[PDB]
Design a protein around this ligand. Structure first.
Ligand SMILES: [Ca+2]
Ligand SMILES: [Xe]
Length: 263
């Protein structure tokens, strides 16, 4: 597979804590009109379609975000030559909340998580959601959201963006999601149906096939949003946004739980 190496400065992730939360959102705010494609990734500490939704609904208000990544670029994957284009928001964490197993906590450790920094400089999730609401990224179809295994990320996003009044059924959940993100794609789904037309579906195997080096920055939460966006824009470019049968990717815009008829 030909090597795909994006310009070096595209592979930089700016860490965000309570100290630079507002200034970073000020930068996001002025870049979005041009770099209108936004990818998101998350890290939580803690019919088949109706099962997935019910499993998610029963878990969202008990799952607490520790990290969240956002990456911005235009439709062709171009990014600003100066300054950060990917952010890793680190949220506040309570050193005494007895909500985890040592397997998970030790797992997180390796993943590059300093709990002490989260306890003393972690950002407040409500403050973050408020900044996200007014950033210009929500409720605007000129902005395209990119996700991988949406359901849970969006579930969470919607959960914080709203009055914690989570919807009560799949149908109403989808309604709210389309209202906050009128233009979005689940890259995992786009790839699954592509890599199902020629016959793994992980972001990693997708990135390999596109020939993206296994840079370690890609292993962090911020790096993940970055890998996601790079992959979306490249896969899209090589495919002139078409599926192996000529169909346009748009056919799957807004699809979380499967296209109408395959649910
Ligand atoms: Ca602007
Ligand atoms: Xe959302």
């Amino acid at each position: 597979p030909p090597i795909f190496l994006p310009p070096p400065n595209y592979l930089f992730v700016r860490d965000v804590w309570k100290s630079n939360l507002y200034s970073e959102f000020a930068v996001i705010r002025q870049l979005v009109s041009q770099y209108n494609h936004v990818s998101i990734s998350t890290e939580f500490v803690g019919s088949k379609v109706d099962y997935h939704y019910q499993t998610m609904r029963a878990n969202v208000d008990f799952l607490n975000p520790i990290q969240l990544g956002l990456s911005l670029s235009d439709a062709n994957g171009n990014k600003p030559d100066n300054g950060p284009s990917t952010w890793q928001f680190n949220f506040e964490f309570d050193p005494k909340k007895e909500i985890m197993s040592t397997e998970s906590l030790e797992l997180l450790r390796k993943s590059g998580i300093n709990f002490e920094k989260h306890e003393n400089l972690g950002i407040d999730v409500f403050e973050f959601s408020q900044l996200l609401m007014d950033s210009g990224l929500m409720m605007d179809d000129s902005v395209t959201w990119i996700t991988y295994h949406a359901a849970y990320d969006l579930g969470f996003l919607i959960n914080i963006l709203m009055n914690d009044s989570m919807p009560n059924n799949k149908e109403d959940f989808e309604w709210w999601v389309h209202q906050y993100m009128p233009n979005f794609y689940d890259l995992n789904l786009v790839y699954k149906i592509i890599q199902e037309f020629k016959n793994q579906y992980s972001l990693t195997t997708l990135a390999d096939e596109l020939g993206l080096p296994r840079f370690s920055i890609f292993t962090t939460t911020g790096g993940q949003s970055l890998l996601m966006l790079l992959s979306f824009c490249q896969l899209s470019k090589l495919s002139m946004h078409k599926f192996p049968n000529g169909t346009d990717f748009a056919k799957y815009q807004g699809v979380i739980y499967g296209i109408d008829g395959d649910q």
